[PDB]
Ligand binder design. Sequence first.
Ligand SMILES: [Mg+2]
Ligand SMILES: [Mg+2]
Ligand SMILES: [Mg+2]
Ligand SMILES: [Mg+2]
Ligand SMILES: [Mg+2]
Ligand SMILES: [Mg+2]
Ligand SMILES: [Mg+2]
Ligand SMILES: [Mg+2]
Ligand SMILES: [Mg+2]
Ligand SMILES: [Mg+2]
Ligand SMILES: [Mg+2]
Ligand SMILES: [Mg+2]
Ligand SMILES: [Mg+2]
Ligand SMILES: [Mg+2]
Ligand SMILES: [Mg+2]
Ligand SMILES: [Mg+2]
Ligand SMILES: [Mg+2]
Ligand SMILES: [Mg+2]
Ligand SMILES: [Mg+2]
Ligand SMILES: [Mg+2]
Ligand SMILES: [Mg+2]
Ligand SMILES: [Mg+2]
Ligand SMILES: [Mg+2]
Ligand SMILES: [Mg+2]
Ligand SMILES: [Mg+2]
Ligand SMILES: [Mg+2]
Ligand SMILES: [Mg+2]
Ligand SMILES: [Mg+2]
Ligand SMILES: [Mg+2]
Ligand SMILES: [Mg+2]
Ligand SMILES: [Mg+2]
Ligand SMILES: [Mg+2]
Ligand SMILES: [Mg+2]
Ligand SMILES: [Mg+2]
Ligand SMILES: [Mg+2]
Ligand SMILES: [Mg+2]
Ligand SMILES: [Mg+2]
Ligand SMILES: [Mg+2]
Ligand SMILES: [Mg+2]
Ligand SMILES: [Mg+2]
Ligand SMILES: [Mg+2]
Ligand SMILES: [Mg+2]
Ligand SMILES: [Mg+2]
Ligand SMILES: [Mg+2]
Ligand SMILES: [Mg+2]
Ligand SMILES: [Mg+2]
Ligand SMILES: [Mg+2]
Ligand SMILES: [Mg+2]
Ligand SMILES: [Mg+2]
Ligand SMILES: [Mg+2]
Ligand SMILES: [Mg+2]
Ligand SMILES: [Mg+2]
Lengths: 229, 185, 148, 53, 124, 51, 157
Amino acid sequence: KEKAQQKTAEERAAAKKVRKAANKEKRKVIFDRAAAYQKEYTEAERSVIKAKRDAKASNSYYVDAQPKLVFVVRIKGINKIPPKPRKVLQLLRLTQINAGVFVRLTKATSELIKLAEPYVAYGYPSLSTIRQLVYKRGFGKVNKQRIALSDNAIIEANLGKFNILSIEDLIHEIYTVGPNFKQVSNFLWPFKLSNPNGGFRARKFQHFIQGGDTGNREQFINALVKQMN
Amino acid sequence: GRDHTSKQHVRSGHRTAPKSDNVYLQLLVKLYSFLARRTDAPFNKVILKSLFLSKINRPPVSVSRISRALKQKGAAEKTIVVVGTVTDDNRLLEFPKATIAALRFTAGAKDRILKNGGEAITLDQLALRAPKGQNTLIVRGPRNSREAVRHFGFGPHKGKAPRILSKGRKFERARGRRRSRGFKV
Amino acid sequence: PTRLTKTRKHRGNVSAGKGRIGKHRKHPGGRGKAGGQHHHRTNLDKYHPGYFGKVGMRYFHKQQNHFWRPEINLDKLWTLVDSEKKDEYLSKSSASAAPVIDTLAHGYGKVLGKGRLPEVPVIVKARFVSKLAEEKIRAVGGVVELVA
Amino acid sequence: RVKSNAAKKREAKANGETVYLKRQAAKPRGSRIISTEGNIPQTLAPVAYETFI
Amino acid sequence: ATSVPHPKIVKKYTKKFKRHHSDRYHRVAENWRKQKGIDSCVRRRFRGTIPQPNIGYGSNKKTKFLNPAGYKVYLVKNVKDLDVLLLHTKSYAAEIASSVSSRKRVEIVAKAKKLGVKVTNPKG
Amino acid sequence: VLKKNPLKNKQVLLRLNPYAKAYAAEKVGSAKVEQAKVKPSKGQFAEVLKN
Amino acid sequence: MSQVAPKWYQSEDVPAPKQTRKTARPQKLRASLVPGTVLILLAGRFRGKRVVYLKNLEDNTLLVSGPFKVNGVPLRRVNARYVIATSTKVNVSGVDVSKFNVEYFAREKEIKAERVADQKSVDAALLSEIKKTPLLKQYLAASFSLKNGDRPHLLKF
RNA sequence: GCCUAGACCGAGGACUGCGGUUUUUACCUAGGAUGUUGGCAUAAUGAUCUUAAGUCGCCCGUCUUGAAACACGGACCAAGGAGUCUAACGUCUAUGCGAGUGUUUGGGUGUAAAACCCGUACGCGUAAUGAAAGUGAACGAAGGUGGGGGCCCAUUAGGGUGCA
RNA sequence: AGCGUGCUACUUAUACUUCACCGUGAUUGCUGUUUUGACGCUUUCACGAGUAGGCAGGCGUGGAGGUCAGUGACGAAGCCUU
Ligand SMILES: [Mg+2]
Ligand SMILES: [Mg+2]
Ligand SMILES: [Mg+2]
Ligand SMILES: [Mg+2]
Ligand SMILES: [Mg+2]
Ligand SMILES: [Mg+2]
Ligand SMILES: [Mg+2]
Ligand SMILES: [Mg+2]
Ligand SMILES: [Mg+2]
Ligand SMILES: [Mg+2]
Ligand SMILES: [Mg+2]
Ligand SMILES: [Mg+2]
Ligand SMILES: [Mg+2]
Ligand SMILES: [Mg+2]
Ligand SMILES: [Mg+2]
Ligand SMILES: [Mg+2]
Ligand SMILES: [Mg+2]
Ligand SMILES: [Mg+2]
Ligand SMILES: [Mg+2]
Ligand SMILES: [Mg+2]
Ligand SMILES: [Mg+2]
Ligand SMILES: [Mg+2]
Ligand SMILES: [Mg+2]
Ligand SMILES: [Mg+2]
Ligand SMILES: [Mg+2]
Ligand SMILES: [Mg+2]
Ligand SMILES: [Mg+2]
Ligand SMILES: [Mg+2]
Ligand SMILES: [Mg+2]
Ligand SMILES: [Mg+2]
Ligand SMILES: [Mg+2]
Ligand SMILES: [Mg+2]
Ligand SMILES: [Mg+2]
Ligand SMILES: [Mg+2]
Ligand SMILES: [Mg+2]
Ligand SMILES: [Mg+2]
Ligand SMILES: [Mg+2]
Ligand SMILES: [Mg+2]
Ligand SMILES: [Mg+2]
Ligand SMILES: [Mg+2]
Ligand SMILES: [Mg+2]
Ligand SMILES: [Mg+2]
Ligand SMILES: [Mg+2]
Ligand SMILES: [Mg+2]
Ligand SMILES: [Mg+2]
Ligand SMILES: [Mg+2]
Ligand SMILES: [Mg+2]
Ligand SMILES: [Mg+2]
Ligand SMILES: [Mg+2]
Ligand SMILES: [Mg+2]
Ligand SMILES: [Mg+2]
Ligand SMILES: [Mg+2]
């Protein structure tokens, strides 16, 4: 009778007590990691601000380090695409409109983005934009399936061998482009954003410089993602 | 819309069940579907796939093949597993004492396995004495010896067998098979 | 059964699987083996080379009974010994007393030499033998006795 | 490059340290400071149109 | 829902899928036929043409085959046919065949009330 | 069965990011920076106004 | 429909609902709803009647009186969403509304002697405070209606 | 960080998970809607049919690069109406036996064209090649090398055995 | 309410985002609780245009072996009918 139902409930209660006690330490670890990430973000910002101010004082010019990360959104449909940009868009895992992916800037990937430039809008994402993307529309590829990032255990079970134990570990790994950026960005399913609230410009399919939407907008990608996520 | 990187709605292309409606083969699949799902033993996963194969994909294993497989170093007391029919070979000079598990045995094969002190058991008896296929050895028959394979991939300078009803000097031997009659391919 | 044929599934579709342009005309390309040297050269040359031409000499009134000579190899020769006495013969055979195997009476004309014999003397009566078949028979201490 | 990678691997091993042999694409450049002593910026403007024929 | 509880029953299409030009010609019956013509306005799905049957209109598997009262309907031809609905009186209802005589029909109705089986066509 | 936004659900936010509690408690989102009131552009950076 | 028999594995047991985690939390009333406020009823029998708001019942309803002598609106409940909360207020600190609750308005034409007595006791204090504001009794005794050119999105009440 | 207006939705169905608050089965907003009130059951509610209104909708079938076409057949309706069967075959699948295989030409038998039983021959296969006269398949564990599922010994790794 | 140009808001496709349902493909697990369905049940994800054409799963018809000891002159079959 309920003997067994209550028995398995008591066994579950004991096992869950032990599991929660063990997980408490891991959660302390990820808490500490997130605090450290915040400290280093703030420290880096103040260091860069101070360096700019110092260069201003000493009759010099501080040249920023070129950005190492970009967020690329395919804003063009799937019809009438030449084979090479089509293959390039497939290789960025941008196989639908309003699909977004994180790309680490080098030469190979830069020439890739240049090839896909007439069909994408991309830019340099801020930390809050990355956090908002991963929190609301962050999905992982688990056994070729699109799984919501609803618990830190999914991230641990798939990226603990890369020292990613939390959603903030993943966010830090994306933002400050880390030694395991490849694994973290390929594990991330391409973000499937909505259309912008407020629309695009009057005509999308022209460079951002000429009043369109394609190409590099750099810091306005954060506003665009805010519109679309 | 999606720019598809692979063909959509594609079946795996592997048999997941026998085409046969034999109720007794189904029972054998019943047993190894449970074993492959629950033993972590790679042997049981191979047997489950092999029970699905079609007639041409499970060629007969002669009693001579088993004799040569038992002649491997350190394989004399292994259990021979044949998912199919074991046939006799009257060209053997001698047969050892062996334990053999097969779907079917021919009259000569069962006669020659038991005459030499061996056992001829079915595949369900194997699953009790070797539920993980411990100390087993799977033997497969020749697939490329079929007559139909003779004509596969036929072409010029391919050396395959022509699809022909009669054989002789008057049947597809003159022009294109001979340099004295034009060319030879 | 007609209920299993694909003719039943094309009912309701206009062209019945024959194409709307190509259709199912009477005999496009000819009848039978027509055009084998002109527009069906690509078929006969690729898949049936040697089709056209004459090779060899004719044989007026060829009687295949003349050429009857079924072959038996050495690895199948001991199957002609009586099954109930095979094991006894394999033990007590010597030069003084070996089993006699009349191959012609089993329907064979020539003994060929594929495979290996037991190292046991046998007396083989045959119409024809190959050079290696008799060498292998003599090596196990046997002999070939010609018959007709 | 095979020999150079082999040479790099052995010497880091001699020092009991590690070395990375995978090639990398060109990365974006780091931060830097531009001195303006003797190099105060000169202001340019687009030039008017002329015919030289 | 006097039957076993079920989700709200959804019928994706409540009209009858009528064959194209079954209204223009008497020889063309309303039984649905898919247009195969090269120029067909219906086969090419022009705006304003008739709806056509497709698997998207399929009924929810939890409300599929249920009459408005929430029961699955089973055809009964004699009193012994009610024996298969003994343990499903809250999920299966019986419908009496039209060719059962007026005598046997009263007998079938009588046994269903004793067993608690609901009857879908009670007057005829 | 139903994805919940951690940016809307505070409980889910703390489930995913335990440091969010400290972030909220310390007002990290409105933290002041302590520095002096200075203006370092008085010299040659006035080359921006004219040249 | 057809001749498909029910199977043995087709059970008839009804599963229990899952344990719901919709623990109720208290209602949030509008800031304009303060006891003593003059309200306008938008629906019901007494639609258009200006009435006095007295108490917030545990049913999420508002206890309301006309007063009945001035208005014809007795002690009853109204819903806060069918009410326009004006800015006029009456001092109701001298009115005891402790005994009024849901069980008072329980459904059992004939009117209870208790209910009539309670009407008089509440209305005495209501009238005493109403007399202080000139034209307040006349305002309460008059029905409310929308005149031509009245825009409720611009008016303050 | 905080307050605030509206809309749509409520899939799931004992428990199990992660958190949070711990008020250590104490709860919670934390693996998907509950609570409460009114009304209706001669009905509020829902479907179909007809019809009006709004909006969209060119005649199907065919050959065709292109058909609503000023391209052809079709006034209407009912019934009939078009990839069949056979001889010989290729691929694939199932079945029986298996170095053999096929009872059915025939013979036995019968409750009589069935079913049941029988065997010699023969066909194909078990040997190829050469125009033919003719000859006719083990150097070796019926070979070596690189892989190779599975199995054996191990102990990341590693070693052994390795059918197709 | 034309031409060149800039700005704010707004309109709506079978497109995109979240959710529901149908089907297809894959996927998690299911026998000392397998329990009269394992050709079954179940968890999860992604996808759905189509002439000629291929394949699959079904609907219907004349007749046949078996079964419902089935329906039926107390009305079979046929036919008309919001
Ligand atoms: Mg990427
Ligand atoms: Mg966690
Ligand atoms: Mg808007
Ligand atoms: Mg705009
Ligand atoms: Mg536009
Ligand atoms: Mg425009
Ligand atoms: Mg511009
Ligand atoms: Mg938005
Ligand atoms: Mg789609
Ligand atoms: Mg894809
Ligand atoms: Mg081979
Ligand atoms: Mg052959
Ligand atoms: Mg010549
Ligand atoms: Mg049919
Ligand atoms: Mg078809
Ligand atoms: Mg078609
Ligand atoms: Mg037609
Ligand atoms: Mg066809
Ligand atoms: Mg045609
Ligand atoms: Mg053709
Ligand atoms: Mg010619
Ligand atoms: Mg010859
Ligand atoms: Mg319908
Ligand atoms: Mg038609
Ligand atoms: Mg046309
Ligand atoms: Mg067309
Ligand atoms: Mg009738
Ligand atoms: Mg009055
Ligand atoms: Mg529900
Ligand atoms: Mg009430
Ligand atoms: Mg109309
Ligand atoms: Mg035509
Ligand atoms: Mg033509
Ligand atoms: Mg065409
Ligand atoms: Mg033309
Ligand atoms: Mg014209
Ligand atoms: Mg024409
Ligand atoms: Mg014509
Ligand atoms: Mg005409
Ligand atoms: Mg006519
Ligand atoms: Mg007419
Ligand atoms: Mg055939
Ligand atoms: Mg017969
Ligand atoms: Mg013969
Ligand atoms: Mg024979
Ligand atoms: Mg090897
Ligand atoms: Mg203008
Ligand atoms: Mg859709
Ligand atoms: Mg389709
Ligand atoms: Mg039939
Ligand atoms: Mg007929
Ligand atoms: Mg019958």
